[PDB]
Structure formats: structure tokens, C-alpha cells
């Protein structure tokens, strides 16, 4: 096993005199996947600039000037490659997955987008009303709105608080320009990463990137990556009630450390211990995760999940559950209680499993090519380099009970959390109450 980790192929990385960092992992695999992961997002958007990164993602495929729509797609389809991607708050990417026999072809394609997007003013005015609809859809996904609102209040006033999607008013008025104003501003090599995994031979990649990414940095600026304005965490709540809904969602959380921080490990292990439930499972007998157990015994929630969504310099360590208009309270109580237990009297026998549970997701986090690239894509971008499963291993193969306690308490005990809840929540008690739920009557 440990030998399995060790025998795992190191990841190659080397940047350009340009700025791009080119890394990737090699295997036997005929197939592969490759992508450019920009340090771009919504967080990087303004009050009138909010949306672009998206409105963008949405035209990032409809063509380039070199090869308009019908052709790009036709060139992509025709070769059997899958060009997919996203755009978060501090992370955007565009990956393709071909047969490795296309590294140089995929790579070019990549470059031709991140650099030259048609942005056909006529293509835009359509994607405009497309998003405005696609947004109206994102909307009844209470499973999400509940998170944005969480951000909305959790980081109220700052850049994170703005949703990756952006207000309707902006998407209704973004200019042919503003998009380009976004592209040319953030889409730069120093903040972009060319990563891939499959059967590829690094050098061949390099040269192709080093070949299609003929970027040239004059000024000292161009070679420098701006650090972002710190976002003020604001223990508070935001309630979008509506007893008209099947059920209510609740999401509460404390400020997260930020990728960098070594504790995100022990912390990650934390979330391992209470994990998540979801009525389909098969376990009123579940592992320690009482939140799970108790969730069953007393039919607390339809589903609950723990999360340590983190960013560059901040984060959101919490939990989110969905429950009938009626059992909302008992749930919080039982749940929030767990946090306490967690960082007041957690045991070794517990952390033991936690770890292994993480070590399982730790591994399965890297299941295939696309996913591997993700980490590489990410790793570098947010951490600085690539964290080997051999490393993560030790990182979290050395977290003892007393360490979890010391950690969670450090970020949960008597901290002012941010709660978010849409739906028939008449039953969720005020703040003070869920607030004094942060300290255990030890």
C-alpha cells in the first residue's frame, strides 16, 4: 500500500519565461484530459463588473476568430474530445479530454480560447437571454441558493459575497467590451496553469504550450499577480422564508483558514467524523457520525453535508441540511451540538476512522484523468505546487484526537457563525440561540 503511494508517478512542472506553469502526470492511459486553470473568478469582479467571468465561460466555446463557431465545435466534436469547464469565485478552468494523441491539437485549441474568443456581438446578445434564463433555473435549486445567500451574508460587503453568476441587471447590460475588459485583464499566463493527465510525455506538452502560448511579458506588472482584497467575515444570518416550499434548507458556518493553512488537514478530518447523511443510505446504525445516526433515529433531515469550502486567504467551514418544515430545530440542535462534542470530547477511535475515510476520498478524489488534472490544475494555483497522495497521507496520517479538538475548537468554539436558510423555517430559533449553541456548557 504505502508502497503503492510511493510508486505513484511524480508530477512534472515547469513554467515559461512567459509565466504559465506547465505541469501534469503520466500513466499508460490512451486517453487523457488537459486544461488551463485561470486564477479568475467572480471575486475578481466589480459592482458593475460582476457576471463577466460567467457570461464569458458561456462564449468561451462558441468560437474564436481563427476558427469561428461551426468549425471549433466541428473540430472538437469530429475528434471526439470533450471540452468542458467552469468558473467559481476564485477559480476558473477549461479542460478537454482526448486520446493523448491530440496533446498538441487540444493544447492549441485551449490557447485559442483563453486568448481569442469570437465574442460575436451577435452571439452575446443571445447568450445574454440564455443566462438570464439559465439563471432563473439556478434559482429554484434551493440546494444552491442557500449557499450563495450563505456567502452573501457570511462575507457580506466584500467580493466573495457576489455570486459567481452575477445580478440580472449586469447580465442584462454587459457590453461586448466589458467581457473583453475581463479577458485581457485576468486571462494571463502567470495566473494560468496548463495541466494534464493520461499518457502524455511532459516535454511534448511543454513544447506545444511553449509553442501555442507565445505570450510575451514586457513590464514588471505583466509578470506580477495581484493579491486580493481581504474579505471580512461577518457572523450573521440571512433568512429567505417561504412556507410555500416543500422544505427548508439551513447552512451555518465559521470562517475558514485558507488553502495555505496546514490545519485544513486536521480540519478536513473533522468533517470526516460527522460526514453526511441522505435518506437513501442504509444506516440508522451508521458509523460514529451520530449526526447521521441521530438523523435517522429521530428522522431529523432529508440530507445533511459537512463542508470546508476554502479559498485563497479565507474559508467557510460549516454544515448544510435539508429538513421538513417541522424537524428543523431538533436537527440544528443535534447537529450544532456535534460540532461541540467534536471539539470538546472527540476520541481517538473516532479520528482513526475519520482519517481512513478521508484517505478513501483522498484517493478517489483522483479517479481518472479529468479529476487528476483538476488537482494539478488546482494544487499549483492555490497551494503553489502539487501535493502528492504520499504527502496528503502523512499530513492527515498524523492527526490525533487531541489535534482535532485543538483545531475545531480553534475555529468553532464561541465563534459567531453565519447561518442561511430559505424555506418554511418558522421553526428555526433566532440567532442568539443558535449562537449560544457554539459554546458547550462544559
Amino acid at each position: 500500500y504505502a508502497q503503492a503511494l510511493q510508486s505513484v508517478p511524480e508530477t512534472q512542472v515547469s513554467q515559461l519565461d512567459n509565466g504559465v506553469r506547465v505541469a501534469s502526470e503520466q500513466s499508460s492511459q490512451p486517453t487523457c484530459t488537459v486544461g488551463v486553470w485561470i486564477d479568475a473568478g467572480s471575486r475578481y469582479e466589480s459592482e458593475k463588473n460582476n457576471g463577466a467571468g460567467y457570461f464569458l465561460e458561456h462564449l468561451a466555446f462558441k468560437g474564436t476568430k481563427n476558427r469561428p463557431q461551426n468549425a471549433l465545435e466541428k473540430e472538437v466534436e469530429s475528434m471526439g474530445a470533450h471540452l468542458n469547464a467552469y468558473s467559481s469565485r476564485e477559480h476558473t478552468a477549461y479542460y478537454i479530454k482526448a486520446l493523448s494523441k491530440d496533446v498538441p491539437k487540444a493544447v492549441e485549441l485551449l490557447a485559442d480560447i483563453v486568448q481569442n474568443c469570437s465574442l460575436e456581438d451577435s452571439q452575446i446578445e443571445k447568450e445574454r437571454d440564455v443566462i438570464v434564463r439559465e439563471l432563473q433555473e439556478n434559482d429554484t435549486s434551493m440546494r444552491e441558493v442557500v449557499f450563495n445567500y450563505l456567502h452573501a451574508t457570511a462575507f457580506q460587503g466584500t467580493g466573495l459575497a457576489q455570486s459567481v453568476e452575477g445580478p440580472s441587471e449586469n447580465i442584462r447590460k454587459l457590453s461586448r467590451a466589458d467581457l473583453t475588459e475581463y479577458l485581457s485583464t485576468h486571462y494571463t499566463a502567470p495566473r494560468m496553469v496548463l495541466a494534464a493527465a493520461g499518457g502524455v510525455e511532459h516535454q511534448q506538452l511543454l513544447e506545444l504550450a511553449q509553442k501555442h502560448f507565445g505570450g510575451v511579458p514586457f513590464t514588471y506588472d505583466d509578470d506580477a499577480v495581484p493579491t486580493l482584497s481581504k474579505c471580512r467575515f461577518t457572523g450573521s444570518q440571512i433568512r429567505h422564508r417561504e412556507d410555500g416550499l416543500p422544505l427548508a434548507h439551513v447552512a451555518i458556518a465559521v470562517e475558514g483558514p485558507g488553502w495555505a493553512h496546514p490545519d485544513l488537514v486536521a480540519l478536513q478530518v473533522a468533517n470526516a467524523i460527522i460526514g453526511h447523511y441522505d435518506r437513501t443510505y442504509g444506516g440508522g446504525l451508521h458509523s460514529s457520525s451520530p449526526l447521521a445516526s441521530i438523523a435517522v433515529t429521530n428522522k431529523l433531515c432529508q440530507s445533511f453535508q459537512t463542508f470546508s469550502i476554502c479559498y485563497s486567504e479565507t474559508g467557510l467551514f460549516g454544515f448544510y441540511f435539508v429538513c421538513d418544515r417541522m424537524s428543523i430545530d431538533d436537527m440544528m440542535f443535534v447537529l450544532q451540538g456535534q460540532w461541540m462534542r467534536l471539539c470538546t470530547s472527540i476520541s481517538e477511535s473516532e479520528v482513526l476512522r475519520g482519517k481512513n475515510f478521508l484517505r478513501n476520498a483522498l484517493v478517489s478524489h483522483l479517479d481518472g484523468t479529468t479529476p487528476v488534472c483538476e488537482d494539478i490544475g488546482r494544487e499549483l494555483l492555490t497551494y503553489g505546487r502539487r501535493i502528492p497522495l504520499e504527502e496528503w497521507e502523512e499530513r492527515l496520517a498524523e492527526v490525533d484526537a487531541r489535534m482535532v479538538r485543538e483545531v475545531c475548537s480553534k475555529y468553532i468554539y464561541d465563534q459567531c457563525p453565519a447561518v442561511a436558510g430559505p424555506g418554511p423555517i418558522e421553526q428555526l430559533p433566532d440567532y442568539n440561540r443558535i449562537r449560544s449553541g457554539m459554546f458547550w456548557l462544559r
Binding site: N298, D330, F333, P429, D430, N432, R433, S436
Partner: protein, 379 residues
Amino acid sequence: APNIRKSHPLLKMINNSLIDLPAPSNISAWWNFGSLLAVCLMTQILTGLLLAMHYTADTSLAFSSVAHTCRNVQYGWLIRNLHANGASFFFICIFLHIGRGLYYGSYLYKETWNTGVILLLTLMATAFVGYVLPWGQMSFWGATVITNLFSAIPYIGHTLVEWAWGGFSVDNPTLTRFFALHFLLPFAIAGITIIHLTFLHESGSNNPLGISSDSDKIPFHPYYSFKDILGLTLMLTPFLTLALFSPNLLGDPENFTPANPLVTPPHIKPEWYFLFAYAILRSIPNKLGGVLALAASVLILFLIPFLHKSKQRTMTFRPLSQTLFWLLVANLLILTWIGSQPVEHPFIIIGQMASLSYFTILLILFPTIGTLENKMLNY
């Protein structure tokens, strides 16, 4: 239930009347009066229970006993002081509590209100006794009228009294049998108070706007618990201030002279928290009338719920009846003054007058200004 705060027969009650109880968000101090009233019920029961530890109910020893209880028992003096004054802080809060309730039509929660009356009545009743106990000139002569006051009720009267109190004249027996009532009664107030709150909880607490509050309602605990603890100290400071700086400030000194069955003090001014009805009683020259007036003087609260006509509950949007209200509150503060005042033309008339506006303002004015304001809205 993993809760416990809800899975325990006893424990639930608490986490259901002090924690988790839904209370309107918007609530003025006038809502503390009650939680205070409790603290009085306590302060009274606690102190008095403790003062009874030294009382000696018996003519020849009764007066002195108390004196002893003061001069001799450590802090016994403090206990007394506190007690006699709790009496007042008690009547004050009650008098305000009734106010609030009157002017937010909390009297619409009928039962919770009717029980309330009972409490008042009893609190008036229990306070009547107890004051007899120290057996001072007042104690005695109050015993003799108030009791004899049931003289009015024909047939069953003269008899009911020569029974009310001991034999045929306020004497030792009446005293012992009063102590008993006093020692007992408070515990009744406590019980009924439970019944009072029960009825309440059936119907959430009111709220100053007089419109549904389900729209808001905050968890009693986090909020109002504190709010009570605060109001506790607020209207605790005065009461204490009195008890430590000018105790007898409210207490008639005339009662510092042991009872004399032979001479009722020229200048018999009843206890302040009683004056109003007192006035009403004397300004209606006729034993029966005198009493009757009185009877209804307090036993009228029972009708307020039926003398409600406003299409709106409270009267915060009823500027008309609103001032009529203070015309009442003042018409009361008046009767009071006129009560602490001997009977001569300068007064007397003033008396029976206010002692007329009183009724009317209630029986008639209110309900009239009531419907009227509704029509000034097309209702």
C-alpha cells in the same frame, strides 16, 4: 427526543414557559409588569413566611411580637421593611399591569384577564389581612370597617360578619383567624397565577400593536428572560430604596400606636393602594350604596371586556379613546388624592364627581368613543 429540554415531563414545562416560548418581538416594559408581579408574590411569600417565623398572633402579644421581630431578630427589621413595601411594589405593579392590559385590550384574552381580576381581588384581600396582624390602631380599625363592610349584604350580613371575624367584635379570635388566612391566601394567589398563565399561553402574549404577531415572534428565552432580569433590577431599586432609606414613607405612622378598641384615630386614612375605591365608598352616603359603589368600583374590571367596541384591539391608533384613557388614569389618581382628604366641600363634591366620571368613563364614554372612532374609518 435527544432534546431532553422537551422530553422531560417537568423539565419541558420550563423549556416551554421560559425558553422556547413564542413571544411577540415588539413588547414594551408594560409587559414586564407580571413577571414583576411574580417577584412580588415571591418577595412577599418569602419575606412573610420568614416574618411569620416570629409573629405571635394574639392580641396581647401580636403588636409587640412584630416590634420584637424587628428590634430583636437579626435583619428582622429589614425583613419587615421589605415586606410592607413589597405590598406596595406589589400593588404598584398590579395597578400598572392592569393599566397596560386595559390599554391594549389584553382584556380580550378574557379568561387570562378574568383570572387576573381574581388575583387583584385576592391580592387586595390578602393585603387587608396581614395589615391587621401587627395590630396597630390602623390594623384594628381597618379590621372593623372592611369586615363590617359586609354588614350591607342583607340577611346573611350581620351574621356573616359575626363570623367573618371571631365572635361579636374584632377581638383576638378575628386576629388569629386572620393570620391564618394571610398565611394561607398568598399561596392561593400563587396557584391562580399558574391558572392565569395557563390561560394565557393558550393564546400567545398580546403585543402593543394589537395585530397578529405570528409574523414575527421571538423565543422567550434569549430575549425576554434578560428583559425580565433587567426590569427586575429596575423596579427593584425603588422598592429597595424605600425599604432602606424611607421605609415608612408609604406607611401611615398612626399604625405605630398599638390598637385601642375604644378610640378610632381622628384621621383614619386607609392604605394608599386602597384610597380610590375608598373615596368612591364615602361619597355615596348610604351604607349599602357606599358599599355597592365600592363593590363595583373594583368588580367592574370584569366588564371591561364587554365594554370593548373598537374594531382594533389596543388603542394606539385610537387617539380619541386614548386621551379618554388618561382621563381615566388621572381620574383615578384624583379619586386617590380625594381619598387621602378629609370630608369638606372643597373635596367631597370633587369626590363624588370623579367618583362618577370613573364609572361613566368606563361604562359609557369608552364604548361610545369606541364605536365612534370606528365610524371615523367607515366601520
